[PDB]
Design a protein around this ligand. Structure first.
Ligand code: HEM
Ligand code: HEM
Ligand code: HEM
Ligand code: HEM
Length: 107
């Protein structure tokens, strides 16, 4: 695999950009997020052409907003789905990991 980035990286939408840190996710398997595509591994950007390249729609497989924020029923784990399970076990982190304002994603 390539080396994991050692600094936070940009995740751009149509209007806002959020910084993603790999360090706190050191014990999550790479494949949980960089999922297989047509049975092969890939570390391309999520919003790459032919991937989740619709930067304005809020629903649908092709929407980057949806694959990031949807709370349930998906084929792979979204950022908000996993963070909601962590907050049930560590409720002190609710606003940092799930808030829409003043959180670690949208400070
Ligand atoms: C597991 C150790 C693992 C590896 C390896 C890895 C690599 C990696 C690379 C090479 C990039 C840069 C992509 C580029 O082409 O610029 C990258 C970026 C993102 N990653 Fe990652 N990553 C590993 C693990 C994880 C885990 C566990 C998750 C989810 C919690 C995750 C997520 C992301 C995200 C988001 C990005 C940014 C993509 C974008 O569209 O900007 N990585 N990773
Ligand atoms: C970048 C790390 C990235 C993320 C994040 C991500 C998430 C993701 C989710 C949550 C789903 C399920 C959506 C649903 O159930 O409606 C999902 C599904 C697909 N993905 Fe994805 N995805 C990331 C990376 C990439 C890349 C680099 C591509 C293009 C090669 C891509 C494509 C797809 C496709 C196609 C699907 C639908 C079928 C499936 O495998 O579930 N994703 N992704
Ligand atoms: C989806 C790409 C996604 C994002 C975005 C994301 C962000 C994120 C941040 C900003 C933090 C806080 C770290 C800090 O304050 O420096 C954080 C922390 C944790 N996350 Fe996350 N995360 C995304 C995805 C996922 C997934 C899919 C999981 C679970 C499979 C996950 C888990 C965690 C955990 C655990 C932490 C640390 C919590 C703690 O106990 O301190 N994240 N994430
Ligand atoms: C709380 C549920 C919450 C809301 C609501 C929210 C909104 C939001 C918007 C409107 C954007 C901009 C869309 C665009 O520019 O196209 C956006 C972008 C991102 N968000 Fe978000 N968001 C909420 C919560 C969180 C949390 C807790 C995290 C981190 C786990 C997070 C992450 C992201 C990421 C990544 C982006 C950029 C990619 C994209 O969705 O286009 N959000 N958010």
């Amino acid at each position: 695999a390539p080396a994991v980035p050692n600094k936070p990286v940009e995740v751009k939408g149509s209007q806002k950009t959020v910084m993603f840190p790999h360090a706190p996710h050191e014990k999550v398997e790479c494949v949980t997020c960089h999922h297989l595509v047509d049975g092969k591994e890939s570390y391309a950007k999520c919003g790459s052409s032919g991937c989740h390249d619709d930067l304005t729609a809020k629903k649908g497989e092709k929407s980057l907003y949806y694959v990031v924020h949807a709370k349930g029923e998906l084929k792979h784990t979204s950022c908000l789905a996993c963070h909601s399970k962590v907050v049930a076990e560590k409720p002190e982190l609710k606003k940092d990991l799930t808030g829409c304002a003043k959180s670690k994603c949208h400070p």
